[PDB]
């Protein structure tokens, strides 16, 4: 009965439709070795503590086809049953031809048979442990197994507990830019396919001729993109679920060279190749392990496009990362999924939290508690209207802030500069919001930031003068956007409340102290409807 999940894109906005309405993945992803029935008891408690609505978890080629033609979906059976018992949804991660550039999750009969399923050859003739996207046997084998997984979901997942599939994991190659095998050179030292030369507005020729100094990297990205599109089409012909690829990001400011980063993945410089080569892949999702605000903000900008829904398919699970939920959703993002949210005795520190404990989880639970009570309403406003979101824009001071060695004039100057940086403006049409971080709930002492950095805010427009507002360790203040020609302005009314059956239910009116000094949020959840008014005095 249930309509298929679908990614919609209209008027440069996006929605992930689940059960016929926009949905936000408030996600969690397991560690990489939790894809087994015995591991799930170490997954669910963290997911319930986090309040996540969707679990991302691997389904490995080596586990569903351990002997060629001998399929085993015993894990998928247990996973679907246990997800449904907990009323959560699933994103399955197809670990196959590539998992972090390598074939470690391909069956032994694949990854130990280089002649049938061939590896990238470097220019010097050394071989890398990265399967070539020009291996036709490898493409056929991956596609065949992925089709069998999709047939399992077609037959056994009629209500779409699984809402989306990631095809491969962090594709590309470390250690070279492309395959330089004889097989690969015969394709490289030849015409660029008609279809790519058209989609990019370029002149006919060989890879070297039309792309020059980008030929090696664009060639790898196109061939991988084509490989992933073919797997994707084969699977969607069985069940047309949304499907996506995740990116082992290059640093957007100082990337270095392809092969230092994972060459051929959907890095920012080849998104045009990926979009032209792989029209069947719904979106290209960034995997975010940069901790600093400016780099993360740049990633969110680069991956949010009229042709690309923003899904933060992975993000580090350390404390600093939780606040990026707010700009992700403010960009119209469809979801956010911290990595390593299970108690299987692993942490990917230095990428994530040094320690995995209930405090680690709580940093994400606290932000999820702001969005879960309005998730369907937010998702619709994000698609059909105007939303905004911001995070605290200074990172935690390093055990260095050099700050103490500064002079006592350099210091008041430091404090004014920090207060300015911790003050964000948002243009909401007739009204602006100013968001500030780390100050009392009364009076106007300048902001000093939270320790550690943690704050954020979400705003959705309900009407010309009315906004839905929730924020965290932050003050939000409204003002007129344009000079008012004689008129004055006030807050007309602030209500705290909730949605029941899609209707607003008031709990209380914020007024007095609670609205004299902006709208002040701590760690606790409050959903507000704010109505502003200009009024005549003359
Ligand atoms: C700031 C520098 C970050 C560079 C390292 C990024 C690689 C990130 N790889 C991610 C994969 O998609 C996951 O399966 C898992 O392996 C994860 C890392 O725990
Ligand atoms: Na959206
Ligand atoms: Na305006
Ligand atoms: Na304005
Ligand atoms: Na409330």
Strand percentage lies at: 25-35%
Largest sheet: 8 strands, parallel, barrel
Trace the largest sheet across and list its strands.
4-5-6-9-10-11-12-13
Number of helices: 16
Task: List cofactors, ions and other ligands.
Answer: the ligand CCCCCCCCN[C@H]1[C@H](O)[C@@H](O)[C@@H](O)[C@H]1CO, sodium ion
Task: Give me the secondary-structure category.
Answer: alpha/beta
* Rg calc: 25 Å
Shape: globular
Please give the domain count: 2
What is the tally of beta strands? 23
Intertermini distance? 61 Å
Helix content: 25-40%
Would you give an account of this structure?
By secondary structure, the protein is α/β, with parallel strands linked by helices. The protein is 29% helix and 27% strand. α11 links the parallel β11 (283-288) and β12 (311-315). α5 (136-156) runs parallel beside α9 (215-236). It starts with 5 loop residues before the first strand and ends with a strand. The structure holds ligand N0T and sodium ion (NA) (4 copies). One sodium ion binds at residues 13-15, 332, 334, 382-383.
